[PDB]
């Protein structure tokens, strides 16, 4: 409803899958080209391409530095304002698939069929495991410091010391497709068949929900949780322990990324290339701008939201009544700065 202007961005020539915010005027789009071009969210000008990976991408992250793994068995550490490769870590026998960074003890992690703890500046190892046979598909942090991980269909935990443990748990029915933290005291996973199960933190398994085709993504709204099942938006609570009113048909094809604006609005991706906004107490408006399947988005609080797809394009979404009163705000500054009007 408010977003009435869009500036399409184009630098890639493969499927764009990943976005991350660096600081609050610029972001980075990393697709299956293996190139990482940073953009400017205020005015949509590309700044610099970070090229050097050969194969497709698997996971990017921002370290307070742009650490990036790919399908070839290597990780390239990068940085803003440089356009140079900082390091070329290639010591992996399988493809690294997770780069979840602990914000507490400045640790960078990996996922390439094992777990290896790394270092901040003097970029060395700290500890190596094997503990897998398929490939680790999800990582998350949790307090009391314990690091959760999915082997294939088993939640296995860790610990940190100046050095880890095993705290296997399995109790499942299919391989785990998603994993999320909450504010504190819990964490939520979801099986491929649609079994939404909540744990606490560790602590005990809590609910073994049914009735919801295949789940894709979660969203913390700690009084309730927001699932993303096949063309559905089934909402599950925490206090009431039941399904607060859901939407059996939200999108046409699928729902494959959900997130939440801070102004009590709910937003989802799709597979036909459609973005929609819901209010809790339902639909508000479309954001029809992509041909093929959208994949991820990101929401700048000051200026607009950014969406990517498998059609190589990246689209900013500004509003036309707040970003038009800034064109005629820099104009009168420039006019009285210039003195005359033609000089």
């Amino acid at each position: 409803n408010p977003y009435t202007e869009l500036l399409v961005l184009k630098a890639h020539h493969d499927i764009v899958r990943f976005l991350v915010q660096l600081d609050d005027y610029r972001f980075a789009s990393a697709g299956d080209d293996g190139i990482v071009v940073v953009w400017n969210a205020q005015t949509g000008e590309k700044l610099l391409e970070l090229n050097g990976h050969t194969q497709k991408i698997t996971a990017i992250i921002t370290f307070p530095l742009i650490l990036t793994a790919s399908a070839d068995r290597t990780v390239i550490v990068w940085d803003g304002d440089t356009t140079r490769q900082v390091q070329r870590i290639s010591c992996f026998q399988s493809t690294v698939k997770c780069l979840t960074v602990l914000q507490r003890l400045d640790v960078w992690l990996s996922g390439g069929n094992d777990l290896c703890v790394w270092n901040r500046k003097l970029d060395l190892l700290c500890k190596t495991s094997h503990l897998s046979d398929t490939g680790i598909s999800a990582l998350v942090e949790i307090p009391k410091c314990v690091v959760a991980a999915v082997g294939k269909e088993l939640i296995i935990f860790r610990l940190v010391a100046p050095i880890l443990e095993v705290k296997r748990l399995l109790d499942h029915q299919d391989n785990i497709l998603s994993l999320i933290n909450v504010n504190d005291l819990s964490f939520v996973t979801g099986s491929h068949v649609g079994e939404l199960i909540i744990w606490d933190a560790d602590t005990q398994q809590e609910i073994k929900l049914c009735q919801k085709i295949s789940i894709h993504h979660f969203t913390c709204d700690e009084e309730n949780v927001f699932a993303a099942v096949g063309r559905g938006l089934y909402v599950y609570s925490l206090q009431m322990k039941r399904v607060i009113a859901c939407q059996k048909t939200a999108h046409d094809s699928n729902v494959l990324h959900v997130a939440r604006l801070p102004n009590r609005q709910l937003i989802s991706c799709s597979e036909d290339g459609s973005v929609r906004i819901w209010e809790l107490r339902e639909l508000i408006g479309d954001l029809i701008g992509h041909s093929s399947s959208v994949e991820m988005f990101l929401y700048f609080e000051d200026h607009g939201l950014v969406t990517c797809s498998a059609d190589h394009l990246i689209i900013l979404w500004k509003n036309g009544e707040r970003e038009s009163g800034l064109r005629s705000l820099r104009l009168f500054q420039k006019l009285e700065e210039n003195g005359d009007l033609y000089l």
């Binding site: 500036l7 399409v8 005015t43 029809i288 394009l313 038009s324 009163g325 064109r327 104009l331 009168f332």
Partner: protein, 386 residues
């Protein structure tokens, strides 16, 4: 109709049409020996009447024995040649310098075609009339005066453009909202096969488009592509073709189009109920020879761009006169400006609301749609007209 020739004490050669038919009847020998030197005549140049009208008579010398040689003009009336003495003096006092600082070299025919091409350029640039040259001087000086708003519609193929614009408007129903979509910022996706019809419709409707900057046009002639939103960014009217589909997959982008169908006689754009487009384009018009109509539309769009200049550069509208700005106050104050003073009604406020934004983007960085691809739109529901 008018003639141009040489002198010496007789005719040397004609230059206008090289001794043509009954358009040329009167002898050059009547003009000859009366435009030479009966006082005897260094660079003499004079002007007489001799009631055709006597004209510019720059006297030139060759020192060599063949000294009397002046080049002479003639036209219809008096004040065409007397009133334009300043632009007939300094274009034959410099075209003779090819011959003067030409054939002054060979006494101590190489520059002959130089004079016989420069002189043809003089008659071609002074071919028209006395009124047309004065209007082109005034339009030249005034387009030198304004410099912001000229790019919006600054752009004899304009005769073929405007004549097909008139044959568009008075021979196609519901064209008021189509031209509203062109003037408002909505991409008129002209769709239909039989290429030449679509191309003539495109070059006819190309007049109404407010181009982005001081580069040529955002028009696209007969694209054949699925048209995702990157061609809707860089082109404001597009000439798609039918393939015997695209109408169903194109309607997914229904927020940014006005799909005018040639083989179906329908279009899909919002409702236009305003008065500015009917005075730009009335249904019945008693205007003949549509180049006149193109002058009418250019005269009207100049006034429209003046209204957009006014709405852009008023300080007390855009700068908020409050500590904390409230968009109810500044939006209602802008709306009170375009209703009361400019006299606009319910969609023309959207038109001037757009052209002002193009004017801001030209003045601020001289780059809309190249390094700032804005593409502002709205959620107004388009209706399927039939």
């Amino acid at each position: 109709f008018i003639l141009i020739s040489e002198f010496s004490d007789t005719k040397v050669f004609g230059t206008f049409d090289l001794n043509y038919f009954s358009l040329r009847i009167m002898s050059v020998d009547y003009q000859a020996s009366f435009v030479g030197h009966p006082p005897g005549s260094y660079p003499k140049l004079n002007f007489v009447e001799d009631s055709k009208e006597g004209a510019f008579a720059y006297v030139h010398h060759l020192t060599g024995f063949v000294r009397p040689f002046c080049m002479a003009y003639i036209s219809a009336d008096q004040h065409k040649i007397m009133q334009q003495f300043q632009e007939l003096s300094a274009e034959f006092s410099r075209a003779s310098e090819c011959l003067k600082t030409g054939n002054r070299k060979a006494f101590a025919t190489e520059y002959f075609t130089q004079t016989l091409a420069q002189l043809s350029h003089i008659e071609h640039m002074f071919r028209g009339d006395l009124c047309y040259l004065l209007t082109s001087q005034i339009d030249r000086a005034l387009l030198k005066q304004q410099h912001i708003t000229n790019f919006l519609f600054e752009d004899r193929h304009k005769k073929r453009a405007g004549q097909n614009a008139l044959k568009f408007i008075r021979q196609y129903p519901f064209a008021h909202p189509a031209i509203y979509s062109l003037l408002s910022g909505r991409t008129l996706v002209v769709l239909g096969e039989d290429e030449a019809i679509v191309r003539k419709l495109v070059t006819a409707l190309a007049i109404f488009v407010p181009s982005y900057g001081c580069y040529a046009k955002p028009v696209k002639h007969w694209a054949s592509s699925p048209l995702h939103i990157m061609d809707f960014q860089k082109w404001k009217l597009i000439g798609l073709q039918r393939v015997a589909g695209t109408l169903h997959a194109l309607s997914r982008y229904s927020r940014y189009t006005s799909i005018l169908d040639l083989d179906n006689k329908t279009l899909r754009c919002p409702l236009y109920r305003g008065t500015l487009v009917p005075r730009l384009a009335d249904h019945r018009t008693q205007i003949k020879r549509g180049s006149t109509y193109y002058l009418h539309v250019q005269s009207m769009l100049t006034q429209l761009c003046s209204k957009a200049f006014l709405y852009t550069f008023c300080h007390h509208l855009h700068l908020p006169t409050h500590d904390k700005e409230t968009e109810e106050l500044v939006a209602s104050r802008q709306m009170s400006f375009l209703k009361l003073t400019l006299g606009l009604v319910n969609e023309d406020v959207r038109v001037v609301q757009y052209l002002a934004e193009l004017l801001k983007l030209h003045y601020m960085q001289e780059s809309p749609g190249t390094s700032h691809p804005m593409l502002r739109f709205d959620y107004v529901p388009s209706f399927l007209y039939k």
